[PDB]
Design a protein around this ligand. Structure first.
Ligand SMILES: Nc1ncnc2c1ncn2[C@@H]1O[C@H](COP(=O)(O)OP(=O)(O)OP(O)(O)=S)[C@@H](O)[C@H]1O
Ligand SMILES: O=C(NOC[C@H](O)CO)c1ccc(F)c(F)c1Nc1ccc(I)cc1Cl
Ligand SMILES: [Ca+2]
Ligand SMILES: [Mg+2]
Ligand code: NA
Length: 312
């Protein structure tokens, strides 16, 4: 599942060749083009790297900490130069400057899936089959090649582009950056992680499953939509601490029946089993009926995406 396509192998080669031409990244070398969005502790800009002419996405994480500390995150982040996969957002470099840490990456012109979902309303099952393949492959890659688990799968961390690529970002490559930060939503965290118990890649599988249900139905799915909400949805509020308690104590969300294929409902159900030991693992998901069916479908993801977000 980590074997590269010809077109994929080529795109990777092109990104690396371009990358080699970029030297050490420095603050003054960037011109801001626009604001891509912001989280609970970071802002992201679309920027031009003046010298190279490359357009990048630059994330600034404003953090006030001794030169000692900062210099350590920069060190761990250097691992990103080794994360090369069609399913992982490309990295250019990381530097510290005037209080904030900068992480420069490949700009994804389709933005993140939370943005796409807001535009689309809900994302069709066949499109989510391709998204599922990408996420599982991206997680397999991180695990196999870098012994890293993502730790923060959610729609805003899956990015897409007009070429039809789907990629993960914001994965836990640096332990120190994770600690020095660590308030990001806990709303996609597995029950085991919320309970302080057992967490491995199994926990990313839960987050992917919950993210797929949200994108399929068009709404964060906890607590479940009542009969009349589903009726308006297809024809066919809780405070954060209340929501995390719900996740730990109540049965997992599921897709509504009768609108999605049984293979897709079964796939999400296997990702959402509360017991991480019973929950499917990457190897099992890679050969799940829904994944095999989706891999065989010729889905024009870029055409769907471009039409939907009005790209162009
Ligand atoms: N490489 C990139 N290309 C295009 N858009 C990007 C890229 N990286 C980030 N973005 C956008 O920038 C937004 C802000 O990113 P983040 O600061 O990581 O916040 P978030 O992921 O939305 O929320 P938190 O901080 O985890 S709660 C994302 O939601 C994406 O829409
Ligand atoms: O950025 C991260 N989380 O979201 C930040 C949010 O803005 C906080 O509110 C993050 C967390 C831990 C870590 F180890 C990283 F490497 C991170 N960033 C990160 C990882 C891979 C790539 I390719 C690009 C980036 Cl940027
Ligand atoms: Ca400067
Ligand atoms: Mg993010
Ligand atoms: Na600056």
């Amino acid at each position: 599942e980590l074997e590269l396509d010809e077109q994929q192998r080529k795109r990777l080669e092109a990104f690396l060749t371009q990358k080699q031409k970029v030297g050490e990244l420095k603050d003054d070398d960037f011109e801001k083009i626009s604001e891509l969005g912001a989280g609970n502790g970071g802002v992201v800009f679309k920027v031009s790297h003046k010298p190279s002419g490359l357009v990048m996405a630059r994330k600034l994480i404003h953090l006030e900490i001794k030169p000692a500390i900062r210099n350590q995150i920069i060190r761990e982040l250097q691992v990103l130069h080794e994360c090369n996969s069609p399913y992982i957002v490309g990295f250019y470099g990381a530097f510290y400057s005037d209080g904030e840490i900068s992480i420069c990456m490949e700009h994804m012109d389709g933005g993140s899936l939370d943005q796409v979902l807001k535009k689309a309303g809900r994302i069709p099952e066949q499109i989510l089959g391709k998204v599922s393949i990408a996420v599982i492959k991206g997680l397999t890659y991180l695990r196999e090649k870098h012994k890293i688990m993502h730790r923060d799968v959610k729609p805003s961390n899956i990015l897409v582009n007009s070429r039809g690529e789907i990629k993960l970002c914001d994965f836990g490559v640096s332990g120190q950056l994770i600690d020095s930060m660590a308030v990001g939503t806990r709303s996609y965290m597995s029950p085991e992680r919320l309970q302080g118990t057992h967490y491995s890649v199994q926990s990313d599988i839960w987050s992917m499953g919950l993210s797929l249900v949200e994108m399929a139905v068009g709404r964060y799915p906890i607590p479940p939509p009542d009969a009349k909400e589903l009726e308006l949805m297809f024809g066919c509020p809780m405070a954060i601490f209340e929501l995390l308690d719900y996740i730990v104590n109540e049965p997992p969300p599921k897709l509504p029946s009768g609108v999605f294929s049984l293979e897709f409902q079964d796939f999400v159900n296997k990702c959402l089993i509360k017991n991480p030991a019973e929950r499917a693992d990457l190897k099992q998901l890679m050969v799940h009926a829904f994944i095999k069916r989706s891999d065989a479908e010729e889905v024009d993801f870029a055409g769907w995406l471009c039409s939907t977000i009005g790209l162009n």
